[PDB]
Design a protein around this ligand. Structure first.
Ligand SMILES: C[C@]1(CO)Cc2cc(NC(=O)c3cnn4cccnc34)c(N3CCOCC3)cc2O1
Length: 291
């Protein structure tokens, strides 16, 4: 389809079985949730869609949420690429965004094997890492800073192609902000300080690469270390090796390409923003990894 659709709130209420908050397996429509809303499964033109019902689930106001709704429509109309999620339409008559359905959910869900899905192979993980970098490259080439790169915001289509999502906090382009937003466990030190730079998206992508390698979430309150980015120091201070942390749920990892991905992640995670590779270099390094 070649146009954006304006849906009435009643149609979206109807096709999501009245925004049925029960999970998919019990006969509900809830697919997941983020900091800015619940995502529901919908069925429109004999077509499955994803419907995000916006809600300030984190620490933001009604005006900030409406601003993110506007920003997401604007950024998604402007940024249409094979490694970005596709906006289909919207409803504002109770704010809703309607997207092309991603049948394999998020990278975060697949790394956790949520609902009994089989673990992703190392081969699949390399392809996803490359696809995600290509999406970030398009945004950076088009002077957009994502500001919320994380595994929950990397979606997977019918062919497990990586599709970057959640453009509500995205910024057109180093500027400083009095409004520090994002997910702590993934944020660069300068972003936690209020800086707005594409260099911070690189850092956050480094944390995603560690999640891909290890299968571990960026943060776990009942784990030691609680933060995944700390493993870079554990490995640097030779108290651990990458082999100690490689996801045991894969059978096809090899030391050469795993060490190549870890080297990319390490460079992305440089504490000094100017020493980090830019996205074009990250793409080159990830392409060389499987060459
Ligand atoms: C296997 C299934 C069913 O159990 C299929 C499925 C699709 C989506 N998402 C979408 O289809 C989707 C498409 N565009 N989009 C934009 C933002 C968020 N989600 C989406 C999600 N998401 C929910 C929100 O958090 C991320 C994962 C989970 C999920 O699980």
């Amino acid at each position: 389809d070649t146009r954006f659709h304006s849906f009435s709130f009643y149609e979206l209420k109807n096709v999501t079985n009245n925004f049925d908050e029960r999970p998919i397996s019990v006969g509900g429509n809830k697919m997941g949730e983020g900091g800015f809303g619940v995502v529901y499964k919908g069925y429109v033109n004999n077509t499955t869609v994803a419907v995000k019902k916006l809600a300030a689930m984190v620490d933001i106001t009604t005006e900030e949420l409406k601003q993110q709704f506007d920003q997401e429509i604007k950024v998604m109309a402007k940024c249409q690429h094979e490694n970005l999620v596709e906006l289909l339409g919207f409803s504002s008559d109770d704010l809703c965004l309607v997207y092309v359905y991603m049948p394999n959910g998020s990278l975060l869900d697949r790394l956790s094997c949520l609902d009994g899905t089989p673990p992703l192979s190392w081969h699949m993980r390399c392809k996803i890492a490359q696809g995600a970098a290509n999406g970030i490259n398009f945004l950076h080439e088009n002077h957009h800073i994502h500001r919320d790169i994380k595994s929950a915001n990397i979606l997977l289509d019918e062919a497990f192609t990586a599709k970057i999502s959640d453009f509500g906090l995205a910024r057109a382009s180093t500027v400083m902000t009095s409004r520090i937003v994002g997910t702590t466990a993934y944020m660069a030190p300068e972003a936690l300080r209020g800086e707005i730079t594409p260099k911070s998206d690189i850092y956050s992508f480094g944390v995603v690469l560690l999640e891909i390698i290890t299968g571990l979430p960026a943060v776990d309150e009942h784990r030691e270390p609680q933060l995944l980015l700390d493993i870079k120091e554990e490995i640097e201070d030779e108290e651990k090796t990458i082999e100690d942390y490689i996801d045991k749920k894969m059978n096809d990892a090899d030391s050469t390409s795993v060490e190549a991905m870890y080297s990319v992640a390490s460079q992305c995670l440089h504490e000094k923003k100017n020493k980090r590779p830019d996205i074009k270099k990250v793409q080159q390094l990830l392409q060389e990894m499987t060459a």
